[PDB]
């Protein structure tokens, strides 16, 4: 009832098989101690994943095709605080949940990413406006003249 | 092959493209602005891309690898039986001495010891085809009374050829030890005059399998099936399609499949649900005919190609279907896991990329097969149980791996290369665990043949350009398992070994020739030779040369990268593996 | 007819249900008084005749010629007479018995080999070399393809050749030694057809000496489109649909798309696009004229005279997509047949023919009978469907135009014009519909046309053989269905007319389509799973048992 996670760092994490069921890649590998490669994700991100599996291994989870329990699913405030982390390493959390097919953790992190992206100030959106290519500068001048009376 | 196709295609055009007044090759920076020497002039808008060392030939290269691995690894290696009509000497009957030797060589213990071995071993295949084996044991018993008769009833001739197809399938999964213990190695090589030192894996096990197929034919030719259509023709053709025969012979099996589909559509029977006023006889007939027709669609799909003019599958597993989903998921599970891959393959030859929404819907229903095969029963000792279990496990893993291959090729989603590496090793480890007794003939269905056909193609092909660590570790087990495939495949096995060799020498060909920049048009022999050989096999598929002989005795009339290209064209030639 | 309240309250000529201005005024069940108890007015003349279409496909076209019965557990295999049906008749047919047959098609049948292979003298290269190839014993697959190609034309040249040439070229007496039949005959009494089928089976076993399905060629389709010129697609419909399906598989394996030449091609290829579009047009003809449930797989996919053949047969494609249908063909659609009748009628009437150039005469006569059958069946589908006046005029008219196409072609080097299956089906439809109309709306000119075609069918020889006789019975029983109508008062429940004729016209289609039900043949394929399946009461049992409708299965 235990499998072994051998990451790109190769830190062998012998976790429970019920932990392994959430990773649907690894739950498929159960049909294939019980080692498997994760050649990209570091094992601290994996340890975050495992601790989430410790927390919500017993939790109940939606049909993952919903709207109400998919898009308007409320977050875990515990896993809000648990994922109040690096912006960068949060993307590695995202890539880990992608790479191991861990969908409710992917959505749970995803919604917190959606929190952090929204609500940003129009000050910086005015500022961080054409960081990427995004517009011809003629249109950039036209936008700045479009609000010219106040901007 | 070659275009620009680099990383981070930008959003808005620069001034140089507006001067340029053509299509916006909105790369970093352009293939056209670099062609005008104004590379940096198209760079100077905002966020000047990144390193100019991302291998920009590689996406074009994988787009043409789609062209290859469609038109070679199914079509070019298997589906071109380019033979002749003049250079093939005639055979008028020629089985009154040949198939009658199998009338001679067949023994009753040699029948029933195959029959009883294949009972729990293969008890899903014929159970998917016909059901009961004891009626078939009864037909082998009456067959020694139905052996050399005079009142050869047409129906009874179908029953006679039925067990030749059954014997074909029994050869197709029996290991060679029990084969030499039940049969005799030598009287075949006596009758052929060939070598006595030919334990059956050395070439003649599958030949005797094809001889049992041929003795099914020799009685089916006497059945007059073109004037006598019936379902057992299609059932035994399912049983023969389980063998390597559709790959070793595409064209004959195409016409036999054509007659089987005409046979089915003679009945004009579509729905498989026992309604209110239905006969229970007709009820069970429809229930059987369901799995019959979906296995028939599976046979339609595996031979599908340019030599397949008449199609059968007209339904979609997602999103003008005929009888789709009004059917109990028992062995149409075996069809639906194939039709899953079917809808993938209307985007292999065509470079039009499918919507990724569809591919992720496919990613959703992938796990439905993954945990509906877990929704079955389980028997450790009934070999058909773990047999069908490993078949469906292999099929969902195969379509999964090919799907992540498609993800990397068409759009390059996150970590999909490592998904390819992972599912490749999982499938190969499943083969390794079935290197055992009772499970060596889990490794004999042509699904593993066509799966390794893709794996040793693309892993070697990505080893060509990216000398990666995991691709090298997988390439070691590739070269090991390529030799360690079962002998039930035979000629295409050796063609696959030559294909592995030619792709390794194609890697060496990339190693010896630097890729020539010509603005953004890149040049290598790897480009042009693979441009040419696919078109060679298409010109073989352009069957005018087999019809130029049909319209009379008519005879028609039709640099650095010209030399080493045309040195590798015959150095490691494709003509070894056309046939 | 306008209904009751249309005649009572005097409203518009309204065959609505019940009316569009009487149901609204509170008279729904009061205005359904429009059409066991009895009735004998012409209310059936709208109420019935469309049921005839159900008869017209499934009994005349399917039931009389195409519906085929076998016996799987009793019929011997081909292990009995493996080569001897092929070898004895290959050893009997000599150089006179090859080329003297071939000179019938060389003089008389110019559109056929141009429709299939192009030239007959190009075929004479192979047939002359066949006497350097009959002696060959280790052929190639190509040479056997040529063998089965020319033995198909050897088959075809048997049938259409009259009996006077045929008794001279072929001797009667050594050949009945093989089968065991009567030597006393001359060939036309269902024996010229039998030796035709014997040579057909010779070419088919040469195809089994080919085993063509391994690597097929255009010799397959060029031989099948020659074999299909006779009633062999009606003598063996199960076999012919199978070989036609093999022609579909083979011809489309060669990836034939364009039918007009292109400039960037091989001239062999660009000329072969027309030189196989002719094969495609005859392939479409065999795809169309074998319209049956036993033929499920279709090929619709959509010089100056071979495409013109498939033009009028595609005008026929606008005709017989309503036989099984209860759908009315629209009057605009039935005029779209008629405005293309205007296209291809005078083009037929501009076709050149010379009584020595019988090649050109049969060249004419194919389209000359196709456009006339278009005329007759077009105004017949006016007449049965819409009950259009001046169409029984056109039925009796174009029936006698076909009488002119037949009676003036029994003569010297013209009787093989009366040996094609198109007249065999068309006169079948004439003697069907005229007998049926004489059952129900009894007129004397229709019975006179019945006597006309009775005399013509007696003039029609027994070269058609066993498929003739069932047609003979078609002339009998239907007229007795007239006598079945004349003896019983027509009954109903007030509107829905009931008759012994009506009950028997049901079981005509029901039992013959039950013979077309191959389900329990598939349960025979399941093997051990056993396949199990007033005057209106008793004279039905009389006329069904006496005039036994299952007698057309031989
Ligand atoms: Zn540009
Ligand atoms: Zn530019
Ligand atoms: Zn009214």
Whose structure tokens read 């518009």?
C12
Nearest to C256 by CA among C233, C239, C279: C279
Tell me the structure's resolution in angstroms, rounded to a single decimal. Answer: 4.4
Q: What is the dihedral of CA C253, C256, C262, C264, to 10 degrees?
A: -10
Q: What angle do CA B362, B364, B365 make, to 5 degrees?
A: 70
Question: φ, ψ for residue B543 (rounded to 5)?
Answer: -85, 20
Contacts of residue B521, defined as CB under 8 A and 6 or more positions apart, other chains included, come to B2, B3
* N-to-C CA span, chain B: 26
Angle at which helices C120-130 and C141-159 cross, to 10°: 110
Chain B and chain C touch, per 3+ beta carbon pairs within 8 A: yes
Helix (H, G, I), strand (E, B) or coil at B148: coil
Please spell the DSSP secondary structure of B382-448, one letter per residue: -HHHHHHHHHHHHHHHHHHHHHHHHHHHHT--TTHHHHHHHHHHHHHHHHHHTSSTTTGGGS-SHHH
C77, burial (CB in 10 Å: exposed 0-12, middle 13-18, buried 19+)? buried
Q: How far apart are CA B189 and CA B202, in angstroms?
A: 12
CB B28 within 8 A of CB B51: no
Helix (H, G, I), strand (E, B) or coil at C159: helix
Helix (H, G, I), strand (E, B) or coil at C518: coil
From B20's Cα to the closest Cα of chain A, the distance in A is 16
Cα B90 to the center of its chain, rounded Å: 30
Residues, chain B: 579
- Contact criterion met (CB < 8 Å) for B47 and A98: no
Q: How far apart are CA C403 and CA C414, in angstroms?
A: 14
According to the 3-state scheme, what is the secondary structure of C193-244?
HHHHHHHHHHHHHHHHHHCCCCCCCHHHHHHHHHHCCCCHHHHCHHHHHHHH
Q: Where exactly are the structural domains of chain A?
A: 1-146
CB C231 within 8 A of CB C424: yes
Question: Is B470 in the A-facing interface, judged by CB distances under 8 Å?
Answer: yes
- CA of residue C35 to ligand 3 center, whole Å: 12
Please spell the DSSP secondary structure of B33-65, one letter per residue: HHHTT-HHHHH-SSS----TTS-THHHHHHHHH
- The secondary element (H helix, E strand) that includes residue A15 is strand A13-16
Where residue C118 falls (left for φ over 0; alpha for ψ -120 to 50; beta otherwise) is left
Q: How far apart are CA B439 and CA B121, in angstroms?
A: 10
CB B210 within 8 A of CB B97: no
Q: How far apart are CA C414 and CA C44, in angstroms?
A: 43
Q: What angle do CA A97, A98, A99 make, to 5 degrees?
A: 95
Q: Which tokens is A29 given?
A: 């590998």
- Contact criterion met (CB < 8 Å) for B232 and C525: yes
Q: What is the DSSP letter of B201?
A: G
- The secondary element (H helix, E strand) that includes residue B342 is helix B332-344
Q: How far apart are CA C288 and CA B512, in angstroms?
A: 61
Whose structure tokens read 């095709």?
A65
Q: How many Cβ atoms from other residues are within 10 Å of residue B568's Cβ? A: 21
Contacts of residue B192, defined as CB under 8 A and 6 or more positions apart, other chains included, come to none
In the CATH hierarchy, which fold is given to the domain comprising A1-146?
Potassium Channel Kv1.1; Chain A (3.30.710)
Q: How many Cβ atoms from other residues are within 10 Å of residue B191's Cβ? A: 14
Positive or negative: CA dihedral A103, A109, A111, A114: negative
Which chains form contacts with chain B, at 3 or more CB pairs under 8 Å?
A, C
- The arrangement of strands across the sheet holding A37-38 comes to A13-16, A2-7, A37-38
CB C310 within 8 A of CB C329: no
Q: Which tokens is B363 given?
A: 């990613």
Q: How far apart are CA B135 and CA B291, in angstroms?
A: 19
C-alpha separations of B455 from B260, B421, B474, C284 in Å:
32, 10, 10, 44
Q: Which tokens is B448 given?
A: 């593993």
C-alpha separations of C530 from B276, C520, C526 in Å:
20, 8, 8
Q: How far apart are CA B578 and CA B78, in angstroms?
A: 8
- The secondary element (H helix, E strand) that includes residue A5 is strand A2-7
Breaks (C-N over 2.5 A) in chain A follow: 32
Where residue B519 falls (left for φ over 0; alpha for ψ -120 to 50; beta otherwise) is left
CB C196 within 8 A of CB C155: yes
Chain C CB contacts of B557 below 8 Å: 266
Nearest to B347 by CA among B406, B399, B298: B406
Q: Encode C147-182: b = buried (16+ Cβ within 10 Å), e = exposed.
A: bbbbbbbbbbbbbbbbbebbeebbebeebbeeeeee
Q: How far apart are CA A128 and CA A119, in angstroms?
A: 14
Technique employed here was cryo-EM
Whose structure tokens read 């909105």?
B26
Q: What is the DSSP letter of A136?
A: -
CB C369 within 8 A of CB C405: yes
Q: What is the dihedral of CA B481, B487, B488, B494, to 10 degrees?
A: 80
Beta strands in B441-502 (DSSP E): none
Chain C CB contacts of B89 below 8 Å: 138-141
CB C311 within 8 A of CB C288: no
Contacts of residue B277, defined as CB under 8 A and 6 or more positions apart, other chains included, come to none
Chain A and chain C touch, per 3+ beta carbon pairs within 8 A: no
CA atoms within 13 A on the CB side of B351: 11
Out of B45, B374, B415, the one facing A98 most closely (by C-beta) is: B415
Longest Cα separation, chain C? 91
- Contact criterion met (CB < 8 Å) for C144 and B96: no
Contacts of residue C343, defined as CB under 8 A and 6 or more positions apart, other chains included, come to none
- Contact criterion met (CB < 8 Å) for A133 and B12: yes
CB C416 within 8 A of CB C427: no
B554, burial (CB in 10 Å: exposed 0-12, middle 13-18, buried 19+)? exposed
Question: Is C145 in the B-facing interface, judged by CB distances under 8 Å?
Answer: yes
CB B463 within 8 A of CB B472: yes
Question: Is B393 in the A-facing interface, judged by CB distances under 8 Å?
Answer: yes
Question: φ, ψ for residue A38 (rounded to 5)?
Answer: -125, 85
């Amino acid at each position: 009832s235990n499998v072994v996670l051998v990451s790109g760092e190769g830190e062998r994490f012998t976790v429970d098989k019920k932990i392994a069921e959430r990773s649907l890649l690894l739950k498929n590998y159960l049909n294939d101690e019980i080692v498997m490669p994760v050649p990209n994700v570091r094992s601290s991100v994996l340890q975050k994943v495992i601790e989430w599996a410790e927390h919500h291994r017993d939790s109940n989870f939606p049909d993952e095709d919903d709207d109400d329990s998919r898009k308007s699913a409320p977050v875990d405030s515990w896993d809000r605080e648990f994922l109040k982390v690096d912006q960068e390493m949060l993307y590695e959390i995202i890539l880990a949940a992608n790479y191991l097919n861990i969908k409710p953790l992917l959505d749970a992190g995803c919604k917190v990413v959606a929190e952090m992206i929204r609500g940003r100030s129009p000050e910086e959106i005015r500022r961080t406006f054409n960081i990427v290519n995004d517009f011809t500068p003629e249109e950039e001048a036209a936008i700045r003249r479009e609000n010219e009376w106040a901007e | 092959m070659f275009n620009r196709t680099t990383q981070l295609k930008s959003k808005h055009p620069c001034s140089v493209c507006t001067r340029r007044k053509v299509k916006c090759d909105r790369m970093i920076p352009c293939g056209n602005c670099r062609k005008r020497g104004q590379d940096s002039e198209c760079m100077k808008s905002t966020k000047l891309i990144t390193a100019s060392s991302s291998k920009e030939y590689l996406p074009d290269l994988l787009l043409f690898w789609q062209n290859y691995e469609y038109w070679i690894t199914n079509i070019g290696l298997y589906k071109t039986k380019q033979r002749d009509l003049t250079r093939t000497p005639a055979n008028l009957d020629t089985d009154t001495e040949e198939c009658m030797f199998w009338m001679n060589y067949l023994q009753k213990d040699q029948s029933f010891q195959l029959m009883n071995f294949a009972m729990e071993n293969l008890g899903a295949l014929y159970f998917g085809s016909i059901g009961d084996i004891s009626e078939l044991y009864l037909r082998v018993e009456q067959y020694w009374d139905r052996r050399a008769d005079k009142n050869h009833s047409v129906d009874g001739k179908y029953w006679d050829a039925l067990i030749w197809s059954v014997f074909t399938m029994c050869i197709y999964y029996m290991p060679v030890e029990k084969l030499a213990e039940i049969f005799s190695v030598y009287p075949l090589h006596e009758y052929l005059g060939s070598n006595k030192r030919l334990n059956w894996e050395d070439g003649m096990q599958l030949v005797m399998c094809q001889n049992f197929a041929r003795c099914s034919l020799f009685q089916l030719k006497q059945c007059d099936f073109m004037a006598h259509p019936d379902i057992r023709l299609v059932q035994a053709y399912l049983i023969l399609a389980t063998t390597t025969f559709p790959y070793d012979e595409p064209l004959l099996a195409n016409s036999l499949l054509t007659q089987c589909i005409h046979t089915f559509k003679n009945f004009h029977v579509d729905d498989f649900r026992p309604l209110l006023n239905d006969d229970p006889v007709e009820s069970i007939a429809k229930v059987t005919l369901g799995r019959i027709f979906y296995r028939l669609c599976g046979c339609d799909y595996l031979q599908s190609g340019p030599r397949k003019p008449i199609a059968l599958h007209t339904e979609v597993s997602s999103l003008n279907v005929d009888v789709y989903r009004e059917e109990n998921s028992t062995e149409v599970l075996y069809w639906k896991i194939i039709s899953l891959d079917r809808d993938l393959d209307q985007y292999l030859n065509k470079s039009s990329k499918p919507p990724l929404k569809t591919l992720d819907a496919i990613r959703r229903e992938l796990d439905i097969f993954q945990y509906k095969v877990d929704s079955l029963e389980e028997d450790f000792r009934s070999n058909n149980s773990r047999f069908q279990k490993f078949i469906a496990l292999f099929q969902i893993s195969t379509v999964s791996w090919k799907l992540f291959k498609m993800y990397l090729i068409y759009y390059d989603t996150a970590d999909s290369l490592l998904k390819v590496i992972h599912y490749s090793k999982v499938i190969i480890s499943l083969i390794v665990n079935n290197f055992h007794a009772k499970s060596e003939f889990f490794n004999r269905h042509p699904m593993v043949m066509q799966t390794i056909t893709r794996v040793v193609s693309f892993i070697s092909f990505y080893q060509i350009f990216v000398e990666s660590a995991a691709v090298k570790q997988l390439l070691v087990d590739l070269t090991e398992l390529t030799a360690n495939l079962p002998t039930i495949f035979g000629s295409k096995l050796d063609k696959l070994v030559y294909l592995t060799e030619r792709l390794s020498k194609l890697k060496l060909l990339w190693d010896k020739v630097q890729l020539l920049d010509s603005g953004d048009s890149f040049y290598h022999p790897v480009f042009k030779i693979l441009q040419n050989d696919i078109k060679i096999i298409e010109l073989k598929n352009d069957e005018m040369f087999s019809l130029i002989k049909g319209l009379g005795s008519l005879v028609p009339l039709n640099s650095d990268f010209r030399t080493i290209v045309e040195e590798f064209q015959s150095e490691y030639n494709i003509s070894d593996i056309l046939s």
